[PDB]
Write a protein that binds this ligand. Structure first.
Ligand SMILES: [Cl-]
Length: 306
């Protein structure tokens, strides 16, 4: 039968692999587009139901999609959420694998705002990467605004009522993708708010430079490869990353790398820091992004770009 969750008809597939399947969908009551996340029921990595709960806790926060339904159907588990646009990694590719300073600053402060609100709801993200930051859809009011999806690695870092930080521990298994993960994550340390921020600084340099100096490294195994990547992150000073770039980005990475384990980061201080880049270069934070000039001004095309 075409319809799951009583009201959500399944359309084209937009992703397959370990995430069971992800589909396009439409609400059969109002026609609004949704994304249908299927997950095999009896599997060794059950994660969807908690991702639905996380969306419900973060419900209403701007930039976080709504969760409309979760339940059992067949031998699959379904999460229906707002369908959104391409990831920042997609637009990165289409923009020639480089964002200009204006776009990076504007995108950064929205990522700082999203992650902040996540922290306000007592959770750390722990999977920061450009592939999990999506823009809206054509014609929508939030078309070129940054969103945050995929919360399967979100963990509670403080008690919601007492606001008391989790204990510091070590010797944990390496969590996330090695290109953006913080240095503390490489060393197997318990993550916190600071690590979500340090991973953003890595993403910011990845947008500005088009690559990171610890990409394309070789090693016999993945354990040794993750260590070589972690090794160059500590060998490479923030100023060398920021070569020919506004030093506020090096200043940002250094300041969040120095944050104590339980310290609350000065989010607005970081946003003002990156905003002062635009004042230094005589630019305005008006919302104009690089991808809004693709294809002659049209935007991004489904079969040329992707
Ligand atoms: Cl090994």
């Amino acid at each position: 039968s075409s319809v799951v969750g009583l009201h959500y008809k399944i359309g084209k597939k937009i992703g397959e692999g370990s995430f069971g399947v992800i589909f396009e969908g439409t609400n059969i009551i109002n026609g609004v587009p949704v994304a249908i996340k299927f997950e095999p029921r009896k599997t060794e990595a059950p994660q969807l139901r908690d991702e639905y709960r996380t969306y419900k806790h973060l419900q209403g926060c701007d930039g976080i999609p709504n969760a409309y339904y979760f339940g059992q159907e067949g031998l699959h588990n379904i999460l229906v959420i707002d369908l959104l646009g391409p990831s920042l990694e997609d637009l990165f590719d289409w923009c020639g694998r480089r964002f200009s300073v204006k776009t990076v600053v504007q995108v950064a402060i929205q990522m700082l705002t999203l992650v902040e609100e996540v922290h306000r709801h007592d959770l750390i993200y722990r999977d920061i990467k450009p592939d999990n930051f999506l823009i809206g859809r054509r014609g929508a009011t939030d078309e070129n605004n940054v969103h945050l999806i995929d919360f399967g690695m979100a963990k509670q870092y403080r008690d919601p009522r007492t606001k008391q930080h989790i204990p510091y521990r070590e010797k944990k298994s390496l969590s996330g993708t090695a290109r953006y993960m913080s240095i503390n994550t490489h060393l197997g340390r318990e993550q916190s708010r600071r690590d979500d921020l340090e991973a953003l600084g890595h993403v910011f340099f990845y947008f500005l430079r088009g690559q990171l100096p610890w990409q394309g490294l070789k090693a016999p195994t993945n354990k040794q490869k993750y260590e070589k990547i972690g090794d160059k992150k500590r060998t490479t000073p923030a100023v060398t990353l920021c070569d020919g770039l506004p030093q506020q980005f090096a200043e940002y990475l250094d300041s969040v790398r120095s944050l104590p384990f339980d310290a609350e980061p000065p989010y607005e201080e970081y946003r003002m820091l990156l905003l002062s880049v635009l004042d230094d270069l005589g630019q305005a934070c008006d919302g104009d992004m690089d991808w809004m000039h693709l294809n002659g001004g049209r935007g991004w095309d489904a079969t040329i770009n992707k």
